[PDB]
Write a protein that holds these residues in place. Sequence first.
Motif, PDB file in Angstrom:
ATOM      1  N   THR A  78      34.511 -56.036   4.608  1.00 49.70           N
ATOM      2  CA  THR A  78      35.900 -55.582   4.429  1.00 49.70           C
ATOM      3  C   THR A  78      35.876 -54.250   4.581  1.00 49.70           C
ATOM      4  O   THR A  78      37.175 -53.716   4.971  1.00 49.70           O
ATOM      5  CB  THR A  78      36.460 -56.264   3.474  1.00 49.70           C
ATOM      6  OG1 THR A  78      35.810 -55.660   2.156  1.00 49.70           O
ATOM      7  CG2 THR A  78      36.523 -57.736   3.060  1.00 49.70           C
ATOM      8  N   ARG A  79      34.925 -53.299   4.301  1.00 51.02           N
ATOM      9  CA  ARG A  79      34.984 -51.976   4.406  1.00 51.02           C
ATOM     10  C   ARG A  79      34.692 -51.271   5.726  1.00 51.02           C
ATOM     11  O   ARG A  79      34.781 -50.186   5.823  1.00 51.02           O
ATOM     12  CB  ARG A  79      34.123 -51.553   3.068  1.00 51.02           C
ATOM     13  CG  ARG A  79      34.507 -51.955   1.884  1.00 51.02           C
ATOM     14  CD  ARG A  79      33.772 -51.082   0.740  1.00 51.02           C
ATOM     15  NE  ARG A  79      33.851 -51.909  -0.385  1.00 51.02           N
ATOM     16  CZ  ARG A  79      35.109 -51.449  -1.405  1.00 51.02           C
ATOM     17  NH1 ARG A  79      35.776 -50.491  -0.929  1.00 51.02           N
ATOM     18  NH2 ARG A  79      34.942 -51.928  -2.554  1.00 51.02           N
ATOM     19  N   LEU A  80      34.055 -52.122   6.551  1.00 50.28           N
ATOM     20  CA  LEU A  80      33.530 -51.680   7.762  1.00 50.28           C
ATOM     21  C   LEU A  80      35.097 -50.998   8.657  1.00 50.28           C
ATOM     22  O   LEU A  80      35.989 -51.811   8.770  1.00 50.28           O
ATOM     23  CB  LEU A  80      32.697 -52.624   8.571  1.00 50.28           C
ATOM     24  CG  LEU A  80      31.373 -52.754   8.140  1.00 50.28           C
ATOM     25  CD1 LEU A  80      30.670 -53.617   8.710  1.00 50.28           C
ATOM     26  CD2 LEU A  80      30.535 -51.454   8.001  1.00 50.28           C
ATOM     27  N   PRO A  81      34.627 -50.187   9.645  1.00 48.27           N
ATOM     28  CA  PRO A  81      35.759 -49.789  10.338  1.00 48.27           C
ATOM     29  C   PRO A  81      35.937 -50.711  11.438  1.00 48.27           C
ATOM     30  O   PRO A  81      35.110 -51.567  11.834  1.00 48.27           O
ATOM     31  CB  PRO A  81      35.249 -48.456  11.175  1.00 48.27           C
ATOM     32  CG  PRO A  81      33.775 -48.568  10.996  1.00 48.27           C
ATOM     33  CD  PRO A  81      33.432 -49.446   9.823  1.00 48.27           C
ATOM     34  N   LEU A  82      37.148 -50.858  12.004  1.00 47.23           N
ATOM     35  CA  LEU A  82      37.727 -51.980  12.835  1.00 47.23           C
ATOM     36  C   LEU A  82      38.068 -51.342  14.164  1.00 47.23           C
ATOM     37  O   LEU A  82      38.576 -50.091  14.372  1.00 47.23           O
ATOM     38  CB  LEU A  82      39.235 -52.409  12.387  1.00 47.23           C
ATOM     39  CG  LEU A  82      39.342 -53.766  11.621  1.00 47.23           C
ATOM     40  CD1 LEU A  82      38.255 -54.231  10.494  1.00 47.23           C
ATOM     41  CD2 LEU A  82      40.432 -54.286  11.272  1.00 47.23           C
TER      42      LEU A  82
END
Lengths: 77, 77
Positions: free
Chosen positions: B34-38
Amino acid sequence: VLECGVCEDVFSLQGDKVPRLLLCGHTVCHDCLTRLPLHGRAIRCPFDRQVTDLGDSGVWGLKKNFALLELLERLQN
Amino acid sequence: VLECGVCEDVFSLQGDKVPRLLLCGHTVCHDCLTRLPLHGRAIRCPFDRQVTDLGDSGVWGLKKNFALLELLERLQN
Ligand SMILES: [Zn+2]
Ligand SMILES: [Zn+2]
Ligand SMILES: [Zn+2]
Ligand SMILES: [Zn+2]
């Protein structure tokens, strides 16, 4: 050690019993995957019947379960 | 015990640290995912930058690593 749910044999770190991933998230050993029915480059998970489409490498193109292999190696070593 | 390769915290059997799978075969804990870049509706694997396309459920649509969870549960008991 952990067993393949299809053949009930233990997974190996490489070769015919290496754990490979279906797109539903289940792991099956390589050999069992080669023994499952194929219909138009599509394989069904034996546990939930969900379809994983195969590419030009077939079962060899299914990704290994890398985290499982790391855990198995760490338990062995 | 086995750690998530990103945060180096241990995986849990459920919740925010549950191991989820990318299409490259790597496992990452739910929270890190959920915290990784998209990149659009897609996420890049933090280890090899390969792309996994997300559906309308985002990270929650990534499959749990069932075999890893089975082994971790056996280790806990
Ligand atoms: Zn098997
Ligand atoms: Zn399945
Ligand atoms: Zn993490
Ligand atoms: Zn990856």
